[PDB]
Amino acid sequence: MVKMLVLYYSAYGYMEQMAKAAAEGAREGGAEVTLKRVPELIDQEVPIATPGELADYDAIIIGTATRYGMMASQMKNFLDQTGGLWAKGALINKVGSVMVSTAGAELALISTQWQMQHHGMIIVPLSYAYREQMGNDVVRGGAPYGRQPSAQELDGARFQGRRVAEITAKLHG
Amino acid sequence: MVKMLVLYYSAYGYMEQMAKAAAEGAREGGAEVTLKRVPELIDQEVPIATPGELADYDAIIIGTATRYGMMASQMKNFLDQTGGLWAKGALINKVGSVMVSTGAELALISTQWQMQHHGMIIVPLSYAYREQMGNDVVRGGAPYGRQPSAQELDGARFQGRRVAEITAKLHG
Amino acid sequence: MVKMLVLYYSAYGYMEQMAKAAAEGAREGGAEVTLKRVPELIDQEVPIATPGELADYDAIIIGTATRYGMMASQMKNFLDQTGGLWAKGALINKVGSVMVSTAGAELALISTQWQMQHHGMIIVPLSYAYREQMGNDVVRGGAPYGRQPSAQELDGARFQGRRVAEITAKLHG
Amino acid sequence: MVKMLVLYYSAYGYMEQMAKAAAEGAREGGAEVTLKRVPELIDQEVPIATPGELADYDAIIIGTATRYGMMASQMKNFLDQTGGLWAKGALINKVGSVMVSTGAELALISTQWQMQHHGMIIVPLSYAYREQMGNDVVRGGAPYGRQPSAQELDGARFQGRRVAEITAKLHG
Ligand SMILES: Cc1cc2nc3c(=O)[nH]c(=O)nc-3n(C[C@H](O)[C@H](O)[C@H](O)COP(=O)(O)O)c2cc1C
Ligand SMILES: Cc1cc2nc3c(=O)[nH]c(=O)nc-3n(C[C@H](O)[C@H](O)[C@H](O)COP(=O)(O)O)c2cc1C
Ligand SMILES: Cc1cc2nc3c(=O)[nH]c(=O)nc-3n(C[C@H](O)[C@H](O)[C@H](O)COP(=O)(O)O)c2cc1C
Ligand SMILES: Cc1cc2nc3c(=O)[nH]c(=O)nc-3n(C[C@H](O)[C@H](O)[C@H](O)COP(=O)(O)O)c2cc1C
Ligand SMILES: [Cl-]
Ligand SMILES: [Cl-]
Ligand SMILES: [Cl-]
Ligand SMILES: [Cl-]
Structure with missing residues (x-):
């Protein structure tokens, strides 16, 4: 299995949920996924990451909350x-x-x-x-879309995770 | 073989040379390479590309001259x-x-x-x-010194071959 | 009076309305305002501008519709x-x-x-x-905000126009 | 007089020199200039600024060293x-x-x-x-040739004075 790191910063829990979605999607892509968050300057069940460990993964997904359009x-x-x-x-x-x-x-x-x-x-x-x-797809399927992430955003995150996972797998196999 | 398009715009011939370098590198990467340039609004032997043909390639390398920091x-x-x-x-x-x-x-x-x-x-x-690269070619016994330098051309070639191999792995 | 050019590109009429708002605001700022649009590659009562005439104004406000985040x-x-x-x-x-x-x-x-x-x-x-x-202001005043520009966006455009006008006036007087 | 803050971050002293140039130019623009640097996480004679004091100035010039193209x-x-x-x-x-x-x-x-x-x-x-500027100083009889060049320093000075005069006009 390829190894993926889902590294995130969440200020209000939004990006954390998005990150969990991405991680799940990546697991569905056949990858060994590790969820971590960056140090501070909140789910403490999630381990804090170190800068030097990034080389230990085949793929890295970075998610971060933003402040007036810029990086956190x-x-x-x-x-x-x-x-x-x-x-x-x-x-x-x-x-x-x-x-x-x-958010x-x-x-x-x-x-x-x-x-x-x-x-x-x-x-x-x-x-x-x-x-x-996706909206048109889920409308056709019979389940249209309609601070806290919507179903569409989470589905997008999952899809992203799985896509990255499969691409990485293709690059290593 | 994977198919690659090297699409470029050159105002003065620099990016054309860079593009030829990249195409060469990609050929050395085991890819079938096509070199093309975008229409205007000087080498007429290089074919002009169409917007719709971009889907016919597995990989696309885009090179362009710039004007005061922006896209041409x-x-x-x-x-x-x-x-x-x-x-x-x-x-x-x-x-x-x-x-x-x-x-x-x-x-x-x-x-x-x-x-x-x-x-x-x-x-x-x-x-x-x-x-x-500079230190590498220095160790090898050939240090680097309008027209792309040897270092820039080598960089273009390396880039092309890298993209080619990545594409091949993604399709193989 | 200082001379201002409100130059715009509108694909669907939104940015045109925003531009008219800005122009009005600029007139309220004591400036002589001229409204123009860029050539094509829709209100034909609005004159088409030339690149070389931009030097004839003390201030220039540029408004444009966008395509997937980039300039038109x-x-x-x-x-x-x-x-x-x-x-x-x-x-x-x-x-x-x-x-x-x-839009x-x-x-x-x-x-x-x-x-x-x-x-x-x-x-x-x-x-x-x-x-x-502004939202809090108009709420306090007794008139809260709530393809086609909203009242808040138009008010913002007007305010912007007047601000630019007054600043220009300060720079010439 | 209008009050201007020249706030800088220098990793190796380059931007410090540029900042001194800008401050000088601003002084020549008839402005009361204060030169300060941001805290870290080498010239200790230059005062360290506070985030809240920025509102005490009519104009603020920010200069910073960069790392691989980004803000310090x-x-x-x-x-x-x-x-x-x-x-x-x-x-x-x-x-x-x-x-x-x-x-x-x-x-x-x-x-x-x-x-x-x-x-x-x-x-x-x-x-x-x-x-x-190059052509200007060439006509004048003094062509330009880790440490900012004469052209860059002159540019910094010109920038400072320009900002100063603009501010003065906006407050006068
Ligand atoms: C330089 C700077 C620019 C800012 N610009 C905006 C802005 O344009 N819009 C906005 O809503 N907040 C802006 N803020 C405020 C921040 O977005 C943020 O909400 C504020 O620091 C408090 O947020 P926090 O409690 O999440 O840390 C700005 C803050 C700073 C320091
Ligand atoms: C809006 C605008 C901004 C420009 N900014 C710069 C600039 O910052 N530096 C520069 O050397 N040329 C600048 N130019 C000039 C062009 O980059 C270009 O060098 C000039 O128009 C002649 O180009 P050409 O002889 O290759 O056709 C600018 C031109 C325009 C229209
Ligand atoms: C290179 C390119 C990228 C585009 N990316 C997006 C996109 O990310 N999201 C989107 O909604 N439309 C995207 N479009 C479509 C355009 O935004 C636009 O809607 C399309 O060209 C037709 O729009 P029009 O009828 O207003 O000209 C893209 C188009 C091009 C050519
Ligand atoms: C994420 C990241 C990207 C970097 N990219 C470049 C780069 O593109 N070119 C470069 O010369 N240095 C790059 N660096 C290195 C730094 O720019 C810097 O030169 C190096 O860490 C030593 O800096 P210092 O000796 O001034 O502290 C990068 C560093 C990091 C952490
Ligand atoms: Cl968040
Ligand atoms: Cl070129
Ligand atoms: Cl529009
Ligand atoms: Cl520096």
Whole structure:
């Protein structure tokens, strides 16, 4: 099995739920998933991650709450202490993906993906067209969509997780 | 073999050379490569691409000249005519990569934005490796010194081959 | 009186209404306002603008519809033909401001403001804190807020226009 | 006189020199200038600034060193502690400007983002003038040639004075 790290920062519990969704989706993708959160400057049942352990995974999904469109200082400060890993090129060709929350945050997405790109990580974006197709799909199936994540957002997170998982699996097998 | 499109816009021939380098590297990666340029609004021997043919490739490398840090209008206007492909989701899970020439970070971000919204899998530059290269070629006995330098061309080749191999692994 | 140009691109009539609001607000700011739209690649009573006329105004407000978070090709193509003006430095120290529509578009705002910045134009941003204060204000006054622009958005546009106008007036008097 | 704060973060002394240049230029613009640096997480003779004092100035110039194209964490962490000032709207209509050192367009965009959301009036670089400068000093008889060059320092000074005069006009 490929190993995936779901690393998140949640200020109000939203991004945590999104992260759990992504992790579940990734487990359904046949990956060994570990859920962790970044240090502070809330579910304590979730272990706190270290910057140096990121090289121990084949894929890394980063999700973070946002403040007025920018990265949360916690996630950015966490990723800033991965200079050694960068110097080694330890994260090169590892699969990565980013989730952001505004509970629009394009700048945050760009910044997080910037830090991930400079590590040489392969980036898996959102499936936008599919995510707008989803409403029509669930309408056809007989169950239309309609601070706390909706069903559509969670489904999107799950799908994202599984997609990243399968892609990683393809890259290792 | 996986099929790759090296699509470029060059205002003065720089990005054309970079594109040829990338295409060569991709050929060395065991990929079937097609080199094409976007329409205007100088090498006429290089075929002009159509927006709708992008779905016919397993991987797409986009290189563009930049103006004061932004995307060239040609490339953006070309990519703006892929609305149908987006609606179909024709480019989802296709491997992509971006080269930019003049710093032009904003252009990189915009091009990668358009490629991301198509759901394309993005392959970035190997930055740490790109600083390692100087020391490498110094150890080898051949240090690096309008027209791309040897280091930049080698970087383009490496990028192309990397994308090629990644695509091959994703399709094999 | 200071002269202001309200230049806009509207695909579906939203940004046009926002632009009219901004223009009215600017007139209330004591400025001589001219409303224009960029060429195509819809109110034909509104004159089409030329790239070279931008130097004839003390202030320029740019509003544009957005496509998946990016600038509309019309506005960008229009601003791309102002190379001569840039070469002269004709727009240096002229007051500028940007409105964007998604009928979030942070990247579009950044790009438009990028083109305006490289001309050396003085940038007047949105009054964010005031714009969230506005709801509470109109609630206190006895008239709470609640494809087609809402009352709050139009009021924001008007306020923006007047603010830009007064700032420009201060810079010329 | 209008009051201006030149707030900077320097990792290796470059942005410190740029900041001194900007402060000098602003003094020549008839402004009362205070030079300060952000806290850490080398010149101890330069006073350390507090997040809440930013409202005491008519104009604020922010200069910061950059790391791989992004904002330095120090400056961003400092500006993140101005939530109260934002809630009050204390920095609305105050004149602002940004200098960045290494291309670092993303850092410029982020810093200007934080300054914009405070409602600060933004004064950019004079780019066309900054390419005019070389030809100017060539005509004058003194062509330009880790430590900022004469052209960069002159640019910093010009920026400072420009911001100063603009602020003075906005308060006069
Ligand atoms: C996530 C991340 C990405 C980085 N990307 C680059 C890079 O693209 N180019 C580079 O020269 N250094 C990069 N670095 C290294 C830093 O920019 C910095 O040069 C290094 O950590 C040493 O910094 P210092 O000696 O000034 O403390 C990166 C570091 C991190 C943590
Ligand atoms: C490169 C590209 C990316 C696009 N990404 C999105 C997207 O992420 N979400 C979306 O709703 N539409 C997306 N579109 C579709 C456009 O937003 C637009 O709706 C389409 O071109 C037709 O719109 P129009 O009739 O207003 O011209 C994209 C189109 C292109 C060409
Ligand atoms: C809105 C705008 C902003 C520009 N900003 C810059 C700039 O910051 N630096 C620069 O060298 N040229 C700038 N230019 C000029 C163009 O980048 C370009 O160099 C010039 O128009 C001539 O281009 P060409 O000879 O390749 O056609 C700007 C042009 C426009 C229209
Ligand atoms: C520099 C800066 C800019 C801010 N801009 C905005 C803004 O544009 N809109 C907004 O709602 N809050 C803005 N804020 C407030 C923060 O988003 C945040 O709500 C505030 O710091 C308190 O949030 P917290 O309790 O979640 O930490 C800004 C704060 C700072 C420091
Ligand atoms: Cl959250
Ligand atoms: Cl070129
Ligand atoms: Cl519109
Ligand atoms: Cl420095």
